[PDB]
Design a protein around this ligand. Structure first.
Ligand SMILES: [Zn+2]
Ligand SMILES: [Zn+2]
Ligand SMILES: [Zn+2]
Lengths: 44, 49, 266, 114, 65
């Protein structure tokens, strides 16, 4: 799947057997991207 | 059956929404993960004020 | 007419200060309770979030969206989703309106209720439009975006009762006061020295005659005159707030009457 | 977590009827009616309107528990006078008064400015 | 966080009055009481609702993520 770096606006798509680090950055803090399947909210 | 399960379950009593998942290697080069789950708690009968 | 009397002391788009005459206390009270809780209104009940890179949490924003006042004029020709024979929701029961905001300028990009865009087909009915009593024409400040933050979501607004959730509340505060001089003695005033001097005199005292010390206590008097002030939020005009309050109360009395009519079946 | 749905305040449950008319065993010619999915708004009003009928000996409503949206209404009328007729007359009286109130408020609203 | 959309107690909309309040404080150089008065916040619950609020989101926006 795809991930996103922490301290820069990037969009990594490196799956397994890759992980760290980032593309044109150097830091190893990677967050996972939001799901495609939309979640509803009872606006209450 | 060549693998033992070591998966992590969401708290049996709690519930909510996966707020943010963090994937990072360790100092010893170990791929470790911190998953943050968010839950909005609304004041209910029995809540301490 | 012939029954309970009304006297509109003040009238505006937001407030109505009037006087109910020849009414029982219970009917005035119940009218108040209905005006507060049991008047149908259109508000956001469903929120689908596609992307949300703003600071606020999803359900936080969703909550704020739920509280937004929407046009509920022709709400009586809209239907409850629970009553509608459709799947989930449609155009006969719900009003769908989108929200697409994105931080463009270097400065903070505000997201208001005016940015809500109706997507569903209103088919003639005056409904769904978010109330904007704002002077600059913005409305409720929903959120704030930075520079690259984005908020993409869709709102399904359904007909609801304030008894179910306060977001469907058509009225704000309903001022309510009877017997300004306490001539009925429904209240034993707390004091330190002089009771009358310590407690502030109401405005409504101008509308009734003060008691005479030579006169004893009127034990046979009830509560006839009620001084009220109904304030609207915008979803429904004040006059229609009190009118639909009356209509609702009357209707749910008629439902009990109808129930009695139906219990005669073998 | 254990909180009931909100619509359970006004939406009739499975099998739940609006009114449950039961014969009172205490005093003769008395009745206790269980109003479901209703509160003080209807109870206090109907009870107060039942005290206007001079052929009604007793009339009192109570909400046994604020958790559940329901109230009991006990009515005792004079002999030769069915209590259901007292409830009906009370309801119709209410509706008429509210119709007059609405009409008057409307005619009073048309004579206003701003 | 951000200015509450409606007053908790009564239900009067107050989420549209925050910017107007700030302007009334800095532009017309009014005091909090008069500013809250001109915004039609007579009841002290709404008066509180705006006066008591702390706009923390303005600091939240200082982060780049
Ligand atoms: Zn990077
Ligand atoms: Zn539908
Ligand atoms: Zn308030």
């Amino acid at each position: 799947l795809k991930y996103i770096c922490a301290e820069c606006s990037s969009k990594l798509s490196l799956s397994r057997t890759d992980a760290v680090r980032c593309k044109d950055c150097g830091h190893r803090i990677l967050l996972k991207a939001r799901t495609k399947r939309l979640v509803q909210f009872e606006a209450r | 059956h060549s693998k033992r399960d070591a998966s992590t379950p969401l708290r049996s009593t709690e519930n909510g929404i996966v707020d943010q998942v963090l994937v990072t290697t360790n100092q010893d080069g170990l791929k470790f993960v911190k998953v943050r789950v968010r839950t909005t708690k609304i004041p209910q009968i029995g809540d301490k004020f | 007419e012939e029954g309970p009397q009304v006297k509109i002391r003040e009238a505006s788009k937001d407030n109505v200060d009037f006087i109910l005459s020849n009414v029982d206390l219970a009917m005035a009270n119940s009218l108040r309770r209905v005006m507060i809780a049991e008047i149908p209104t259109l508000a956001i009940d469903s929120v689908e979030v596609e992307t949300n890179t703003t600071v606020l949490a999803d359900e936080f924003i969703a909550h704020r969206l739920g509280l937004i006042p929407l046009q509920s004029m022709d709400i009586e020709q809209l239907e409850y989703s629970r009553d509608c024979f459709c799947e989930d929701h449609c155009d006969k029961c719900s009003v769908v309106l989108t929200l697409q905001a994105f931080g463009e300028s270097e400065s903070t990009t505000n997201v208001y209720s005016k940015d809500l865009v109706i997507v569903s087909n209103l088919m003639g009915r005056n409904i769904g439009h978010p109330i904007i009593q704002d002077k600059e024409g913005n409305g409720v400040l929903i959120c704030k975006l930075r520079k690259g933050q984005e908020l993409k979501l869709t709102c399904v607004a359904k007909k609801g009762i304030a008894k179910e959730h306060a977001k469907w509340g058509p009225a704000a505060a309903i001022e309510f006061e009877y017997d300004p001089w306490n001539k009925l003695k429904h209240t034993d005033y707390w004091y330190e020295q002089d009771s009358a001097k310590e407690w502030p005199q109401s405005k409504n005292c101008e509308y009734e005659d003060p008691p005479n010390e030579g006169d004893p206590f009127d034990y046979k008097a009830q509560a006839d005159t009620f001084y009220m002030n109904v304030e609207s939020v915008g979803s429904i005009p004040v006059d229609q707030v009190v009118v639909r309050g009356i209509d609702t109360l009357q209707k749910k009395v008629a439902s009990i009457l109808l129930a009695l009519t139906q219990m005669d079946q073998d | 977590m254990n909180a009931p749905d909100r619509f359970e305040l006004f939406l009739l449950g499975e099998g739940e009827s609006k009114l449950k008319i039961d014969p009172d065993t205490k005093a003769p010619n008395a009745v206790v009616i269980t109003f479901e999915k209703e509160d003080h708004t209807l109870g206090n009003l109907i009870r107060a309107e039942l005290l206007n009928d001079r052929k009604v000996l007793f009339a009192a409503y109570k909400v046994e528990h604020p958790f559940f949206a329901r109230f009991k209404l006990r009515i005792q009328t004079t002999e030769g006078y069915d209590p259901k007729d007292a409830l009906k007359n009370a309801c119709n009286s209410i509706i008429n008064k509210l119709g007059a109130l609405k009409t008057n408020f409307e005619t009073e609203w048309n004579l206003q400015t701003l | 966080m951000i200015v509450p959309v409606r007053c908790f107690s009564c239900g009067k909309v107050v989420g549209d009055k925050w910017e107007s309040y700030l302007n009334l404080l800095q532009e017309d150089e009014l005091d909090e009481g008069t500013a809250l008065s001109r915004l039609g916040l007579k009841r002290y619950c709404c008066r509180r609702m705006i006066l008591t609020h702390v706009d923390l989101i303005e600091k939240f926006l200082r982060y780049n993520p």
